[PDB]
């Protein structure tokens, strides 16, 4: 498995893209991850929050 | 009812058009809270526990 | 800009707001550079 170092770049890659992936599932302290959530229930000046 | 023995209804199977609610004049103060009053009657809430 | 309110609806002509006097009335935008002034006139425009 002299050949998996180049297997590691892929999983980093791959790892950081499903990571990417992954926090659009955080909301960082919002009510929602989903914008669009927002978009549907709240009137905009108090949606920038 | 009183408020510790508050009445609770499960609405279901509902056209809710809840625009007509609030733009009756009787309701004096209104307030809404995860949802904007502008976009209650074009939504889905799978249910009204009132 | 100067008019007459009820006085308990005195809520509505600030910026954010969703009822009578702001859709229908008097909106007021939320980028609002100033001020509002409000008094009672009950001796003035109430007979």
Redesign the interface.
């Known amino acids: 498995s002299a050949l998996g170092k180049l297997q590691d770049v892929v999983n980093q890659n791959a790892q950081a893209l499903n990571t990417l992936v992954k926090q659009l599932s955080s909301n960082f302290g919002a ?1 929602s991850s989903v914008l669009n959530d927002i978009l ?4 905009k ?2 949606a920038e929050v | 009812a009183s408020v510790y023995a508050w009445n609770r209804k499960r609405i279901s199977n509902c056209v809710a058009d809840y625009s007509v609610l609030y733009n009756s004049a009787s309701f004096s103060t209104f307030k809404c809270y995860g949802v904007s009053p502008t976009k209650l009657n074009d939504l889905c809430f799978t249910n009204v526990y009132a | 800009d100067s008019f007459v309110i009820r006085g308990d609806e005195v809520r509505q002509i600030a910026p954010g707001q969703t009822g009578k006097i702001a859709d229908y009335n008097y909106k007021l935008p939320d980028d609002f550079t100033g001020c509002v002034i409000a008094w009672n006139s009950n001796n003035l425009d109430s007979k």
């Open positions: 009510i549907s229930r709240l009137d000046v108090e």
